[PDB]
């Protein structure tokens, strides 16, 4: 049992919400949050900018002293930070950004790094201001992450979407 709330079962082990994931992160408190990050740690928009924002810049402190020690991570790669005031840590993944023109078979090595983590709350990767399908995102989510993760949708009707096409 954990404290998760209102989500819709897809699968075995994957959830889903129409939710911000900032107002979930500080309500729930998870293990790990999980980031739509840039191999850069820039935490500009989207999810990220967001995460970023609700830690009152901390989380990007923390980033660029990990990349001035460690240099950029990969597409597809990530790294485990500190979750501030959100979670205990923050999984920094990095999707494929299409606006970028960057290899969406990435995508299910983004994925892979969920798996490294018992219980997740996540947003759908690449989607948003990467550029991805949601529903490609969601599909490569069930059909890649072993374990337990709870995906927070932003978009009302982009959740009715997501559930009502769902195979
Ligand atoms: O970028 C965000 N979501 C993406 C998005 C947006 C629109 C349509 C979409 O299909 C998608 C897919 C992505 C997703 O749903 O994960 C996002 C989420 C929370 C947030 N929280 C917040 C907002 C304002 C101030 N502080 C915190 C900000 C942005």
């Given at each position: 049992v954990n404290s998760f709330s209102g989500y819709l079962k897809l699968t075995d082990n994957v959830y889903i919400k129409n939710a911000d994931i900032v107002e979930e992160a500080k309500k729930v408190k998870p293990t790990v949050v999980v980031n739509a990050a840039n191999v850069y740690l820039?935490?500009?928009?989207?999810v990220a900018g967001a995460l970023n924002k609700a830690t009152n810049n901390a989380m990007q402190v923390e980033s660029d002293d990990y990349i001035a020690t460690n240099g950029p991570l990969k597409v597809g790669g990530s790294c485990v930070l500190s979750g501030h005031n959100?979670?205990?840590?923050?999984?920094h993944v990095v999707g494929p950004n299409v606006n970028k023109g960057e290899?969406?078979?990435l995508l299910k090595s983004a994925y892979?790094?969920?798996?490294?983590?018992?219980?997740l709350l996540a947003?759908?990767?690449?989607?948003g201001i990467f550029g991805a399908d949601p529903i490609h995102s969601l599909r490569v989510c069930v059909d890649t992450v072993r374990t337990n993760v709870y995906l927070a949708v932003f978009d009302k009707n982009l959740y009715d979407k997501l559930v009502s096409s769902f195979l």
């Open positions: 820039k935490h500009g928009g989207g959100l979670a205990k840590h923050c999984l290899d969406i078979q892979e790094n969920f798996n490294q983590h018992e219980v947003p759908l990767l690449s989607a």
